[model samples]
Target: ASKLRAVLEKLKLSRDDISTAAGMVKGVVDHLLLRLKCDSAFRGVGLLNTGSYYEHVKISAPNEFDVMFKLEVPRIQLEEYSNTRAYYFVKFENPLSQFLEGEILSASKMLSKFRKIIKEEINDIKDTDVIMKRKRGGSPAVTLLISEKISVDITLALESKSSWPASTQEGLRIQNWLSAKVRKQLRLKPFYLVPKHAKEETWRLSFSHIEKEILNNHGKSKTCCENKEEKCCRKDCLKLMKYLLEQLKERFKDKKHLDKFSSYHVKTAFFHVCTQNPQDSQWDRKDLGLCFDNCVTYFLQCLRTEKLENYFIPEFNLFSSNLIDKRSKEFLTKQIEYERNNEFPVFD
Candidate 1:
């Protein structure tokens, strides 16, 4: 989500190029699954077409995928954990492989069994939504959309760290790993390679839809800053809010059609803002204030409008805020537990 500009600049990729790349990546992934004996592989995977700048895909519904693997144990909780390294993999394949013409579709079955083993032996962790797709088309390859969510950590040697910028490089590395793993498991050669670039030092990943918005919205500062926090405050806030609102409206506008065609659930909108501390010497005050205030006002005003308030959530946090304190986790955990037990909403 971060570093869109850096990614574009370093890789010399544009939004349209990214979308084409994403499509190519999907093809590579699908071909891999086929080799693994997964029937109708392409049908189970698809790239999301949000028309925004970000490159993200949603796995079709009724078949969700999430894999969380950790590389290192937190120093404080190492004793409570057994393995310092873990890997979780999820695959979506034709459920009716035996009845279908192609491979056995056994990869998904194996993944499900593996997941159960992890749940029994490893620490219980929460599951996050990965992708949702609507059914369309007649060909088996076009019927299902396959999307995956992956979370993993790795310890890098100093040499590795010195080789590339951390965020963007790490992201590309992860994507490479995932792509390679899928190909190997499926025993397929890649058809194409989609190169991703870091937009900024902070944002390494790239999305076609998100990239489009960034390019279009770039340099268009808003003037909605009632607090006089910065010039163009309101304008920027309105712009961001308008974009978010439009996204939501489009989703809801065709909800009935989506419900009939897709298996993904429609959920309320949520806004999350991560801001660098004003005290940070490296922070750019002018630009930082704009991002921070825009995030805040967008959440408070457009997102929280009476009509959408119930389904929207807003959260703002500073990168170097109190949340990073040593005791922050313990304090936050207790507070969360208290609120949950009392049936209190996490947000006021």
Candidate 2:
């Protein structure tokens, strides 16, 4: 107890705070990887371009004791726009116990640094009229058409690779190490592992999120791969919208008088954002249009009892004065002018 208390003090957290801190630390690390512009960080990382798709940072560790790791990130496409690349990185530490300790500490430090960055950005926003205007709802309805930016899935797998030696001896070694560490930290019966195959494996980690709409009666496999049609299908868009509506329902369920809003309101909002005109594509416009109509109608009917008459709708307008960072403002202005001149649809 005394040693645990000392460790908690060092972490500046109580036992109750550790779980939440861990989650925050992970988020900070992910955002840093996405936003980092440092050239040195790319050093020692491999880059591969698979035609229109590319991958980087094939294998990496935070430090030298890493044994082996592999990571892959699939490319993300938004209509005709696509990111230059996507990346993933994983690391393994030697003397597993020591590695876990270091990982926790490193995650904590990264969170602290990221918090400072957010503070600086907030301060910068305070002096900008453009950002100030956004706070006042000066932006147009089109802007509200874009749903919350979300990443649909993240998966992590450890000790699941084929390279680990298969044997009770290896298993016992890993089990002993993990048992001691987890028992000490979590104060529960330590978990044990036995090799199902020839080799011993101590830990396996994996996680995934289906983004609500994508989760249907058919499960993940069916949702991810369904139908024989080319390009994005009606079912796919319906699934996405269903996900958005479900999220809204969950979030707003506890609000006072939320029963007044029906699912149709959510469906309409999704349709306004995701639907594109038939003229935009050379293929099956009618099919796409029908899919959009059906999805919206189904959603509305589903929530008819919610009576959501007073729900607020968002406006989507561009404000020249709403800029905060110079670079962001420049990008927004260029996009706005491009949209004005081109017949392309705007995704607010």
Candidate 3:
């Protein structure tokens, strides 16, 4: 337990690191947002900060950021693009069609235009350190290389009218955790679509807004984790989980299969564990070691079975064959086994 606590302490970001990096990133984003509004397509566009950083689960240096350019669209139709239930064909008649590819609301077309505008306006951003990074083939973000250490991913997403896709009907099993009222209110909120594809003109549905809401307001009561007496290790357990995965990835950088797993996978699993043990007392501060070990065991279970469902959309299996092969899954499972059996030497 002391050893686990030691690793977590070292993983904590300094206050200075957070403030300095966040300050510069916000400045650049603010500048871009102000200039972007003048363009007709982005007239009413707003900014949303998603991803691990905003969720407060980001480890190490606060270098990477996920910023979404949210544009409101009129009522639209969505059809499933893949059997995985992750991708969708967005439909809406548009003056916004200039932003679409063919009749479908094309994420690539919108993202392409988004990248172009950011590139043109970047040189005038006032900070010579903030330069546009070369596009990474199919990535949805227009990545900005802020210094050598910091990167900001500017992604374009359409904010659609309320009502989640049918795929998510059975997901977000928070009935035992956050209550039906919380789920009802969250569903009433609009959902965002990001430019993610598997060699098709489709957009991936984003529940980032809801994810942030639940994580920030996590726990059964308003005062949960608020004081020393009531402190829960939910966030701390997540941080250790993230640190473990990050370390494992670094150790096996040459392994292509490892790339299939991400911080989001860990987060989704953590959310599931939260629902299973909704009581804050189960994650008591004094039991940090047990709580974290239980999370690792759950992840190992997912790997062994090769079945980790997407938190927002259960129909989508994150460990599906299309994303990773059987041999790779076995290899990762062994590596994690080695870490647990060997006391996570990578952490040291």
Candidate 4:
């Protein structure tokens, strides 16, 4: 009890920390937008702040951020790259040849343009603390490093209408956690397609807007967390899980066993368990240790089975050989087992 609670106290960010960092980052982003909107290529572009930071699950300092530059596509067609449906080819009904490399909208071409504009504008930014980071291999983000403490990843995204691709028919199983009515309303909101690949014309489907909505209103009952006396430990559990994963990855960086593991996988598994155990009483605020352990146990099970499915796209197995190999999976499983049995010395 003492250690888990103590660690969480250290893992949390203060309100001052959040507001100062968010304000500084937003000022830089707003300045960039003023420049980007002036260019014809990004005329209707808007910002969508999404990631662990926005979801309220980010641990420690507010150093990392994810922001999407959204461009709405009024008329479009999506073609599946494969049966997985996680990747799509976006085809505009009326071709805007300016952004297209072929029949479909070219993510590579658009991302390059986005990066170029950011590079040019960063020099003119009045705040000397902000500068563009060198692009990482195969990454879609144009990262900005602020005062060397905060880093923001800005990616270009195409926002589409509420009609989702057929592949999502089996996913977002939130009937128990929320309700059919809530789910219907969420589905009515637009989804985003972001550039995630290198050379391929494939665009990854993103439900970040929906994710933010679900996590913000994460309660079975209307008064679930609203009551001051009956707080829920859902966000705490997620934060602890993310911190544990971050620590483990840092510890095993030499071995690289946990290289492929990410906070999103932890989030996906947490959502699955939330649906399975929908009652708020099960996640009482006082029961933080049990809830955190329950989340860890579910993730351990996923590692043991080597099958963590993407929450929004059920068909995509995040733990498949393509993403994580058999040896790494076994290594991580054993490492987690050791930590679980040893009271998670990593947390200490």
Candidate 5:
């Protein structure tokens, strides 16, 4: 018990580090806006603090940061390229798209131009000594490597209409957990689109803010986890799952097979688990180990059946049919079960 306790106990971030990080993030965004604000697409663009930091799911080093620089171009047309409704070809209906005519109002061109402009903008950040990583071939964000220990993602996003993606029409089944009114409110909220990839090239709808909203208000009763007097092991279990997965990958060959698996998978699974066990009592902090073990069992079932779906986007399975080969999946499932049964060797 003491050994297991030490694992979560050791993950305290320094106050100095936290303050420095906050300042660094602010300065980077400030500098970026100065360079980009004049362009129409960049005009009303706002910075959204995303990923683990804002959500409070972060573990270990608080080194990685994600900030979405949203270009709020509303009343746009979205055409799905693939069936997932996750990816799209978007055209801005506003007159500005006509002014920024070379984009052909194509997200592909806008993103291509945006990427180039951002790199040029970063090159002008002479004071901070920012090292921009090469644009990863299939990736959407322009990664900024500041120090060996710090990296930031300045991803470009678009604020679109209330219409959820096709694949999501019957998905995000949180009605029972959050009720019809809240679900309707979520529908009224603006959807986000990011420069995803080459289709008509560059534009995938993102439900990050929605996902964050779900996390913030994720309780069957209104006061479920909100009551400081009461607590749940939901986030704790996720942290544990993420930590274990991180450690287990190191034990694999070239750290290859599990490269695609990430904290997102664990997160998606948590939502599904929450939906299954909507009652807060099931996740009481006192039953941390039990709740954590159940999540692990659920994760194993997901791997074995390959049925894990993104909470926001059901069509897009985290564990896709072709993502992991038969041998690798078998190896990973066995490795994970070993930790689960043997008191989680990775925790030590």
Candidate 6:
């Protein structure tokens, strides 16, 4: 039992390791974004030190870092894609439409060139020990291999503030918990597009900044874990769930289907469960074990039923048709039940 905290402690990165990685990550991206001297059409550029690292949910070794550099663009419109609500086609109300020409959902030369420039730029980076990863399709990121194993996803976010998808408008039920005022404050921030599988063609909309915001202010009471320094097991439960899922994938020696389900899926499911039950007392730190069990129970239900909806974009089901196969489901459900019934023996 005492080993729980010890294991959680083991998962964290040392301050020195984090410091070294931080400098390297920002240094590589900062150098490249400045060196590119990209066209004025891209407007201006900025950075988001995102993913698990920035979100504070990062577990185990700090082997992967996700950061995004955003290209500010003039607002025009989002021509929504039918397949995924998170994807869209953009028009400039400015000069971007000229480059975009006719195709509503085709990869733009401008983006390909930007990707090319980033790859070239990574090579020119002087001090950092960064190597470009070879051949990933329509991938929006300049994947840098660092320290041999630690990889950094330096992605480009093409951004503008127009209407977010209607599906998202009614969601993020934080008004009741965080207040209508806070929700209004977050609405004005720019949403963005990242080059997804379909490339700049089927550009996926991202609200990463909003994601950071929610994770930061994730309590029903503004002072729930503030001033008095009261702690809750919410983040702990999340970390445990993420660890459990990843362990199943690793130790089970199964197919790639389970690998397709990412930590993001688990995170989104966490948000939905929070919305349905918004109370600080429900996740008191003293109940870490019990709270963790509840989270796993919710996930097990999601696995068996297969209805894990995206918290923001309800239209995007986290599990698509091919993302999980029947055998994968059987393994996951069986494994999760074993862990749950045994009070998550995976920690053992």
> In candidate 4, what are the lDDT values of residues 1-348, reduced to their tens digit?
568888878765353443567767778888888898998778888777523223333465456766778888778788888665788888863434687866788877877788889989888877658888665643446878877677787777888885888888788989877998888888888888887652278888888677768777899888877879769989888877888888888788888778778788888999988987898888988888888888989988998888988787898888888778889888888888899899989988
Which candidate model has the greater lDDT, 2 or 4?
Answer: 4
lDDT of 6 at 329: 66
Total clashing pairs for each candidate: 50, 22, 0, 0, 2, 0
RMSD of each: 22.4, 23.9, 2.4, 2.5, 3.2, 3.1
Positional deviation of 118 in candidate 1, in angstroms? 16
How well does candidate 4 match the true structure in TM-score terms?
A: 0.92
Best-matching candidate per lDDT: 4
* Candidate 5 per-residue lDDT over residues 1-348, each given as its tens digit: 344446766654342343466556567777777777877667776666533332222354466666677776766766777575577766544545642444335655565666777788777777676777666643436777665666777677777765776777767777877787888888888778776553246466677787767766767777767778567777677778877777776667485777667677878887788878777788887788788888888988999988788777777766766655666667679999899779888777
Candidate 4 residue spans exceeding 4 A from truth: 13-19, 49-58, 93-95, 137-140
* lDDT tens digits by residue: candidate 1, 113-156: 32333233222212222222223211111112223522111110
lDDT of 1 at 136: 28
lDDT of 6 by residue, 1-348 (tens): 345565566665352343566656666766776766465644466675423333322454466677677776765567776666777776543455545657452445666666677777777767857787645645445667766756776666777776666757866667766678987888777777777753236677777678768767788887767755667767776777777777776766456657666677788777776776678888787777677767777887887877687776776766655556666666678888887677656667
lDDT of 3: 0.78
lDDT of each: 0.25, 0.26, 0.78, 0.78, 0.69, 0.67
Alpha-carbon runs more than 4 Å astray in model 2? 1-105, 125-234, 237-244, 247-251, 255-348
Q: How do the predictions measure up, each by TM-score?
A: 0.21, 0.23, 0.92, 0.92, 0.86, 0.87
Can you list the residue pairs that collide in candidate 4?
A: none
lDDT of candidate model 2 versus the reference: 0.26
lDDT of 3 at 331: 79
